[PDB]
Design a protein around this ligand. Structure first.
Ligand SMILES: *[C@@H]1O[C@@H](C)[C@@H](O)[C@@H](O)[C@@H]1O
Length: 130
């Protein structure tokens, strides 16, 4: 143990609070990591929660390409390319995943056997799949 009101690496930043007796925290870049932030990683596949998102992730949390919002199936669902608020998320002619409702990760109407179920399009990891 090394009570130093902080502990990072790779030249991290040793910070410490004083308005609560002791509320410090390793001050390392968000792209850092490694126990005490000893690596220059770069985790950030969605600065938001999935509201807009502008990457390439088009599959769901399984791998399927998910159904586009123009697939009559999703048209039968709710948030597709023919509801009334799809113009706010631009769902028509496109796929990826949208989260205009109440959810943390971006989901997409992906066919789940016989009913396009919204699945938080797994958007984790983003480095050549490795
Ligand atoms: C910790 O403090 C911050 C403000 C930056 O100077 C970092 O480079 C440093 O490690």
């Amino acid at each position: 143990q090394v009570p130093s009101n902080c502990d990072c690496l790779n030249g991290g930043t040793c910070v410490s609070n004083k308005y609560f007796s002791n509320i410090h925290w390793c001050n390392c870049p968000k792209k850092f990591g490694g126990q005490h932030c000893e690596i220059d990683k770069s985790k950030t596949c969605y600065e938001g929660n999935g509201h807009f998102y502008r990457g390439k992730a088009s599959t769901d949390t399984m791998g399927r390409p998910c159904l586009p919002w123009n697939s009559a199936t999703v048209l039968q669902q709710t948030y597709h390319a023919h509801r009334s608020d799809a113009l706010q998320l631009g769902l028509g002619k496109h796929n990826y995943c949208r989260n205009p409702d109440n959810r943390r990760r971006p989901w997409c109407y992906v066919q789940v056997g016989l009913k396009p179920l919204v699945q938080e399009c797994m958007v984790h990891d983003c480095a050549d799949g490795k």
